């Protein structure tokens, strides 16, 4: 997250870290058994880390749970990042508490201008590299579809939306991929892609979660 702020320990209790020997992506807990992330975060041997603040220090509220299975969306296209969504099942159910909590799925899309909370452990610099140890947060509005498509002509599908600031300086980053965009108490987006981070007229692009709720519900019910 570039241009954001330190969230505060466990203030985003649905935020998970995906670990394969190191943090590599975010995710969101959607019930005690299931995490949603980005398909471009797929790899084998994922351990889900819940209750994290400082990802480099055991602080006492963590749960580390191996994934038993990962399911990439059937229509995921790695060339265009269309349908950039994946589900991860936990080998054992998480223990829900004030620091480890699920986020509700949306019933409908959010309107342009709605304020959202974006979070993750990604790079905090727009040109250089500096990775934080504690969770970072950004408040960012949903941008109009026209401003989103104007920024990325030929590249935005109906399964994507933009959020952030056309003036730059505030964006998600590499390392935030797969993490949540939460608006009005619902998981509206997944950190997906963008043109670098915090550049001018190139806002962040996010998977449009509301388009996938039927697939999420059917897939988790059958797995």
UniProtKB/Swiss-Prot annotation:
Which UniProt keyword terms apply here? Calcium, Digestion, Disulfide bond, Hydrolase, Metal-binding, Protease, Secreted, Serine protease, Signal, Zymogen
Could you state what the record's PTM comment says about this protein?
Answer: Subsequent cleavage after Lys-125 leads to alpha-trypsin. Further cleavage after Lys-170 yields pseudotrypsin. A cleavage may also occur after Arg-99. Not sulfated on tyrosine residue(s).
User: What InterPro entries does the record tag this protein with?
Assistant: Peptidase_S1_PA, Peptidase_S1_PA_chymotrypsin, Peptidase_S1A, Serine_Proteases_S1, Trypsin_dom, TRYPSIN_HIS, TRYPSIN_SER
> Where does this chain mainly localize?
secreted
Please verify whether the record's keywords include Secreted: yes
Gene3D superfamilies given for it? Trypsin-like serine proteases
Tissue expr: Synthesized in the acinar cells of the pancreas.
Control of this protein's activity is summarized as: Is inhibited by scorpion cyclotide trypsin inhibitor TopI1.
- Enumerate the residues binding substrate: 171-172, 174-175, 177
Cofactor annotation: Ca(2+)
Spell out the GO cellular component terms annotated for this protein, sorted alphabetically and separated by semicolons.
extracellular space; serine protease inhibitor complex
Reaction equations catalysed: Preferential cleavage: Arg-|-Xaa, Lys-|-Xaa
Name of the protein described by the UniProt record: Serine protease 1
Species of origin reads Bos taurus
Q: Which gene encodes it?
A: PRSS1
